[PDB]
Write a protein that binds this ligand. Structure first.
Ligand SMILES: CCCCCCC/C=C\CCCCCC(=O)OC[C@@H](O)CO
Ligand SMILES: CCCCCCC/C=C\CCCCCC(=O)OC[C@@H](O)CO
Ligand SMILES: CCCCCCC/C=C\CCCCCC(=O)OC[C@@H](O)CO
Ligand SMILES: CCCCCCC/C=C\CCCCCC(=O)OC[C@@H](O)CO
Ligand SMILES: CCCCCCC/C=C\CCCCCC(=O)OC[C@@H](O)CO
Ligand SMILES: CCCCCCC/C=C\CCCCCC(=O)OC[C@@H](O)CO
Ligand SMILES: CCCCCCC/C=C\CCCCCC(=O)OC[C@@H](O)CO
Ligand SMILES: CCCCCCC/C=C\CCCCCC(=O)OC[C@@H](O)CO
Ligand SMILES: CCCCCCC/C=C\CCCCCC(=O)OC[C@@H](O)CO
Ligand SMILES: CCCCCCC/C=C\CCCCCC(=O)OC[C@@H](O)CO
Length: 447
C-alpha cells in the first residue's frame, strides 16, 4: 500500500536503473573530449583536435541510431527484460575498458561496446515503464514524467562527480567511476525487477515464425556483405584515414531517413529539417561549447567539465513551469508548427549570443562564464517547445537526433579560435531565418 509518489513500486526500480545508466553515460561524455585531447598531446593518438571533435559528434550519432534497432531485437528475439540487462553489461564493459592502463587501443573497443549496449538498454527501459500501468490507467502521464526526472537527475550530477574525480585522481579512476555507476544500476535492476516486474517480458512477445527466419538472415547477410565490400573498395583507392571513415558514417546516417521518405501529409518534410537542425546545436554543447569552456573562459578554480551540468539543470528548472503553461494557456495555443518555429529561433539565439563576446572583445582573451550560462539557458528553452509536442506531430524521433549529430561530425571541424565569431553567426542567423520561414508555412501545413 506504499507507492512511489502515487505510482507502482516498479517505477522506482526503473527510475534507479535508468538514472545510473544516464549517470555512466553523461559522466563519460563530460571528459571524453578532454581525455582525447590529453591522449593527443602525449603522442599516443595521432589525430587532430578537429577530428577528435568530430569523433565526439559521430559517436553520439551512432548511439541514437542503434536505439532504433534495439526495440526489434527485444521484441522478436531475446525479450525486453534480458535486453536491458545485457545492454547494461555491454555498457559496463566499455567503461571498464577505458579505466584500464591502455591508451588508444582501448578507445575504439570501448566505443563499439557502449554503442551496442545503449542500443539494447535505452529503448527497452521506456517500454518496460509502459508495462507498469494498465492501458486504462491515467497515472501513466505522471509516471513517465517521474521517470524522465530521473533521467535528468543522473545527467546532472554526473559531470560534478566524475569531473571532480578526474581532477583528483586522473582519467582512469574517473572512467571507472562510470563503470561502477552502471554496475549499481544493474544491481538495482536484477534484484528489484525480480520483485517488481512482470515475468511475461522475460521472452520476446512476438517470436519469429518458422518461415520468417531465412528471410531475416538473407537481409542481415546482404547488409554486412555490401558494407564490408564498401570498406574493401575504400582501402584499395587509398581512402583509409579516419576522416574518410567518419565521412562514410555521416553518409549512412543521412541516407536512412532520406531513403525512407521514398502525398496526403508531406507536412513534416520541413518540420523534420527543423528538428534535425535544433538537435545539431544542442549536441554541439558537449563538443563546441565544451571546447570554448576549456579555452575561452577562466576555469582555473573548478573542473571545466562541470559546465556540462548546465544542460540538464535548466530542463529540470524549466519543467515544472511549462507543465503549468499548457494548462494556464489552455483555450488558444501555439499550434505544433508554431512551437517548432519558436524553438528553432531560440536555439539560433543561443548561438548568436556567443558571437557577441568575440565581436566586442576580440578572440584573444577570456570572458565571463555567464556567457555559456546564458547560451545554455536559451537553447533549453527551445527544447521545451520541441521535445514534448514534436513526438506525436517514433523510430524517426530517435532518428532526427542521429541525423543532427551526423551533421555535426562535418561542421564542428570548421570551429576554432579564428573562425569563432563567424561560426556562431552563420549558424545562429541561419537558424532564425529558417524559423521565420516556419511561422509562415505554419498555416499551409495543417492537414
Ligand atoms: C532488422 C535489423 C537487424 C537487427 C539484427 C537482428 C539479429 C541478427 C540475426 C538474427 C537471426 C537469428 C535467429 C534467432 C532465432 O530466434 O531463431 C528462431 C528460433 O526462435 C526458432 O523459432
Ligand atoms: C563486439 C561484438 C560483441 C557482440 C556480442 C553479442 C552479444 C549480445 C547479447 C548477449 C546475449 C543476449 C542473449 C542471451 C539470452 O538470454 O538469450 C539466449 C537465447 O534465447 C537466444 O536465442
Ligand atoms: C564492480 C565493477 C568494478 C569496476 C572496475 C573497477 C576499476 C578497476 C581499475 C580502475 C583503477 C585504475 C587502475 C590502474 C590505473 O591505471 O590507475 C591510474 C593511475 O595508474 C594513474 O595513471
Ligand atoms: C548503405 C548505404 C550506402 C550508400 C553509399 C553511397 C556513397 C558511398 C561511397 C562514397 C563515399 C565513401 C566515403 C567518402 C570519403 O572517403 O571521402 C573522404 C576522402 O575524400 C578523404 O580522404
Ligand atoms: C535576449 C536575446 C539576445 C539575443 C542577441 C541578438 C543577437 C546579437 C548579435 C548577433 C550578431 C553579432 C555579430 C555582429 C557581426 O557580424 O560582427 C562581424 C564583424 O563585423 C565583427 O567581427
Ligand atoms: C526575462 C529577461 C531578463 C534577462 C534577459 C537577459 C538580458 C538580455 C539580453 C543580453 C544581450 C547581451 C548583453 C551585452 C552586454 O551586456 O555586454 C556588456 C558586458 O561586458 C557587461 O559589461
Ligand atoms: C539585442 C541587441 C543585440 C546587439 C546588436 C548586435 C551587435 C553586437 C556587437 C557589435 C560590435 C560591433 C559590430 C561589428 C564590429 O565588430 O564592427 C567594428 C569593426 O570596425 C571592428 O571589428
Ligand atoms: C552558477 C555559477 C556560475 C559561475 C559564475 C561566474 C562568475 C564567478 C567568477 C568569475 C571569474 C573570477 C573568479 C575569481 C578569480 O580568481 O579571478 C581571477 C583574478 O586574477 C582576477 O583577475
Ligand atoms: C538528399 C539530400 C542531399 C543533401 C545533403 C545534406 C548535407 C550533406 C553533408 C554536409 C556537408 C557539409 C559541408 C562542410 C564540410 O563538411 O567540409 C569541411 C570538412 O568536412 C572538410 O573535410
Ligand atoms: C537549406 C537549409 C540550410 C540552413 C542553414 C544550415 C546550417 C546553418 C548554418 C551553417 C553554418 C556555417 C558553418 C561554416 C561557416 O560558418 O563558415 C564561415 C567560417 O567558418 C569561415 O570558415
Amino acid at each position: 500500500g506504499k507507492t512511489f509518489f502515487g505510482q507502482p513500486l516498479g517505477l522506482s526500480t526503473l527510475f534507479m536503473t535508468e538514472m545510473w545508466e544516464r549517470f555512466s553515460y553523461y559522466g563519460m561524455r563530460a571528459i571524453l573530449l578532454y581525455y582525447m585531447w590529453f591522449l593527443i598531446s602525449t603522442g599516443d593518438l595521432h589525430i587532430t583536435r578537429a577530428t577528435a571533435a568530430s569523433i565526439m559528434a559521430i559517436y553520439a550519432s551512432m548511439v541514437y541510431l542503434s536505439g532504433t534497432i534495439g526495440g526489434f531485437v527485444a521484441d522478436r528475439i531475446i525479450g525486453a527484460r534480458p535486453a536491458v540487462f545485457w545492454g547494461g553489461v555491454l555498457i559496463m564493459l566499455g567503461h571498464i575498458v577505458l579505466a584500464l592502463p591502455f591508451g588508444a587501443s582501448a578507445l575504439f573497443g570501448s566505443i563499439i561496446l557502449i554503442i551496442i549496449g545503449t542500443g539494447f538498454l535505452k529503448p527497452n527501459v521506456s517500454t518496460l515503464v509502459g508495462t507498469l500501468y494498465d492501458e486504462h490507467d491515467r497515472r501513466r502521464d505522471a509516471g513517465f514524467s517521474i521517470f524522465v526526472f530521473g533521467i535528468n537527475l543522473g545527467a546532472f550530477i554526473a559531470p560534478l562527480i566524475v569531473g571532480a574525480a578526474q581532477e583528483a585522481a586522473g582519467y582512469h579512476v574517473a572512467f571507472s567511476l562510470a563503470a561502477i555507476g552502471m554496475f549499481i544500476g544493474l544491481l538495482v535492476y536484477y534484484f528489484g525487477g525480480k520483485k517488481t516486474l512482470d515475468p511475461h517480458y522475460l521472452r520476446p512477445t512476438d517470436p519469429l515464425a518458422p518461415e520468417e527466419v531465412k528471410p531475416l538472415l538473407v537481409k542481415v547477410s546482404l547488409a554486412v556483405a555490401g558494407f564490408i565490400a564498401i570498406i574493401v573498395v575504400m582501402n584499395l583507392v587509398g581512402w583509409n584515414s579516419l576522416p574518410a571513415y567518419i565521412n562514410l558514417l555521416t553518409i549512412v546516417a543521412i541516407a536512412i531517413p532520406v531513403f525512407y521518405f521514398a502525398l496526403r501529409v508531406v507536412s513534416y518534410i520541413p518540420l523534420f529539417i527543423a528538428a534535425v537542425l535544433f538537435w545539431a546545436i544542442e549536441e554541439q554543447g558537449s563538443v563546441v561549447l565544451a571546447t570554448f569552456a576549456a579555452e575561452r573562459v577562466d576555469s582555473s578554480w573548478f573542473p571545466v567539465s562541470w559546465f556540462q551540468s548546465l544542460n540538464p539543470l535548466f530542463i529540470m528548472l524549466y519543467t515544472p513551469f511549462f507543465a503549468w503553461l499548457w494548462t494556464a494557456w489552455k483555450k488558444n495555443q501555439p499550434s505544433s508548427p508554431t512551437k517548432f518555429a519558436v524553438g528553432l529561433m531560440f536555439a539560433g539565439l543561443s548561438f548568436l549570443l556567443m558571437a557577441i563576446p568575440g565581436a566586442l572583445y576580440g578572440t584573444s582573451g577570456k570572458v565571463s562564464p555567464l556567457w555559456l550560462v546564458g547560451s545554455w539557458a536559451l537553447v533549453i528553452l527551445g527544447e521545451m517547445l520541441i521535445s514534448p509536442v514534436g513526438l506525436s506531430v517514433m523510430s524517426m524521433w530517435f532518428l532526427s537526433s542521429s541525423v543532427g549529430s551526423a551533421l555535426n561530425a562535418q561542421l564542428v571541424t570548421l570551429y576554432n579560435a579564428k573562425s569563432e565569431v563567424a561560426y556562431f553567426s552563420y549558424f545562429g542567423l541561419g537558424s532564425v531565418v529558417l524559423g521565420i520561414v516556419l511561422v509562415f508555412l505554419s498555416k499551409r501545413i495543417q492537414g
